[model samples]
Target: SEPLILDAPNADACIIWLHGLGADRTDFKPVAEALQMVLPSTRFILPQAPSQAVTVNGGWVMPSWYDILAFSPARAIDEDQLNASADQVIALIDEQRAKGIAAERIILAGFSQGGAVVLHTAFRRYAQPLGGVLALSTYAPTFDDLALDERHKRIPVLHLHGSQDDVVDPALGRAAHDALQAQGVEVGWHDYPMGHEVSLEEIHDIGAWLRKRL
Candidate 1:
């Protein structure tokens, strides 16, 4: 299936946003619309993850990139499932490129579990650093064993998480920041005063950050 996409046509830059578990592309529409106003020349594409009900969410049907083994705030992503989702995201990037969007003109951003996918894909994909990565309310899993193969280590990454988030603790954000930094990755870490959902401050920061990079 074709991934859901949106563009401003005259936009000089694009943001490919991935939503959290059990949410569809529309989940980020409000934020994306706000960004469109902030960067009038920018486009935002919110892709719907293929149909998959979250395992830990009482079988609620929704668009999700992968399954969750557990819903606990501390539970980590299923490695195999996560890698598979990363592969799909890579495919979508390629598709966008084929449609004439230059890799350097694109920014990969996501929230929660979506954040984890972006982190993994940004580090592992063979493509060169496009614009940058924004991982909100999430973290990179098991950095101790991520094999970078020397080809995927140069991308810049920005991580933002709420200190009060219970869905995914803020510590994971710190660990991701430190590990990526140790690997010589360019990382900017931010903390908000809110919880699991995106805040106005974060949305503003994201728009400003994208303007700086793209």
Candidate 2:
């Protein structure tokens, strides 16, 4: 799928925000717009996930990064497919780099299933220090398999979750945060009162966090 790109005025940096399962690139357009209000010089790249049958969704075809084999104990994710999607996102980052944005000025942001993919992708062995990572309403699918790249060891992470989230439990979010913390990664975590959704307050907080980065 072709991504939905929004170029900011005098853009010097870029952010690639991925959508959740069953959602297209347009899902987080408003969120990107909100962030642009604060960081007017940062370009926003919203990539569309590939369509595939999701097992947890009873084989329903939808826009998703990978197949969810199960959702118990922890999500049983298709590692190969997840890595494939990660490569796609990495290509997007490289595209921005070719356009003159440095790797340190790029941010990988995602929601739900997309969030899980970013977490897995950004911490891999070859990953570098991008602007940072913004993961919302998701858990790290490859937490146990993580082999952090030296460049990404000090990269910051902003993890936001809903307190009442049932789709991706709040516990899962905290666990991911704790895992990163154990690796000495700098992480900021926030929990809202809602469930499985981003709130206006969350948007404001996201903008505030991006302010320091971009």
Candidate 3:
């Protein structure tokens, strides 16, 4: 899938942000641009998920990283599809690297379902230590019995969630945080008072986190 790219002059780092199910690449352009004020040298990459049938949505077609087989506690989804999407994300990373950005200078970020994909991609699939992972309001449904890469242990992760998140469940996100820490993934957790959405304070915190990593 073609992505919406926002290039920065003299850019050294890149943030590849993925959208949640039913959303497109342009969903977070404003947030990326808002971040540009603080992260001037950072470029943004927003990739669109291919439209397909969602099992949980009564087999209705939608833009999703994977098909939700069921709405169970783990959000039983198509793991193979998730892997495919993760590979697509890695393709973007490799392309960015070929264009001069280092692998460690690229961050894999996503929201909701997108966040789940990025978590799996960075922690399980990608063998390199990326800049970091920003899993926003998301959980890893396929993160059990994890066969994690040793080299990616240094790749820190920041998981931000809403305390009252009904879409993904705050407990699920916390479970993800605990699982990552169990594998020594160096992940940090934060929660806001809102629901399944972002807040201004969280955006500011994102900038601070990026400043240290990128």
Candidate 4:
């Protein structure tokens, strides 16, 4: 599916956002608009995940970055599918680069499963220094086994999750943060008193974070 694009006149930076499973590109549209108000030079690109059968969702078809074989003691994801999604994210980053946005000025933001895809893209596949990554309420099951790109060590990552997030488990988010930190990557973790989703305060925090970077 074609992405939903939000433009800034004479934009110098760009942010490509991906939505959580079962959601579409428009899921984060309002949030992106609000963030752009503070960052007038940023253009937001929101891409839709392709529809597929999710085994965890009783084999029902829905928009998903990859299949979740299980979400138990640890998330079990389809590696090949996740890699495919990461490739797509790399393509989006290239497009932004071709449009005059430097790799260091482009950020990848995603929620839940989409966040996992960006994590994989920014750390494992993409070989450039990204401006930053916004991983919201997500986990990387394959983080330990990743054939990482060394350049990501210079890229900062901001991980925000609900302290009470039950859907993806707040611990999963913290583990992802810890894993990045162990790799000597500049990553920060913030938790809110919420559950399984973003809050108004989180949106405000994201704007503040972007202003400092983009």
Candidate 4 Cα outliers beyond 4 Å, as residue runs: 73-75, 146-150
C-alpha displacement of 157 in model 3, angstroms?
0.6
Alpha carbon RMSD to native, model 2: 1.2
lDDT of 2 by residue, 106-143 (tens): 99998999888898878872356787999999998789
Q: Which candidate is the best by lDDT?
A: 3
Prediction RMSDs, each to the true structure? 2.4, 1.2, 1.1, 1.2
Q: List the residue pairs that clash in candidate 3.
A: none
**Of the candidates numbered 1 and 4, which has the greater lDDT value?**
4
Question: What pairs collide in candidate 2?
Answer: none
Taking the tens digit of each residue's C-alpha lDDT, what string does model 4 give over 42-73?
99999989988898789899998888887675
**lDDT at residue 160 of model 3 (Cα atoms):** 97
Per-residue lDDT over 25-144 for candidate 1, one digit per residue giving the tens place of the 0 to 100 score: 788888888888877767787877777666777777676666775755444446777777788778777776776777777778889878888877887653566668888998766465
| Candidate rank order under TM-score | 3, 4, 2, 1
Per-candidate TM-scores read 0.87, 0.96, 0.97, 0.96
User: lDDT by residue for model 3 over 7-117, one digit each (tens)?
Assistant: 999999999999988997999999999997888999999999999899999999889999998889584788889999999999999999989998878999999999999
Q: Let me know the TM-score candidate 3 reaches against the reference structure.
A: 0.97
Candidate 2 versus the native: TM-score? 0.96
How many Å off is the CA of 118 in candidate 2?
0.5
| Deviation in Å, model 3, residue 214 alpha carbon | 1.3
Which stretches in model 1 have alpha-carbon errors above 4 Å? Answer: 58-61, 71-76, 147-151
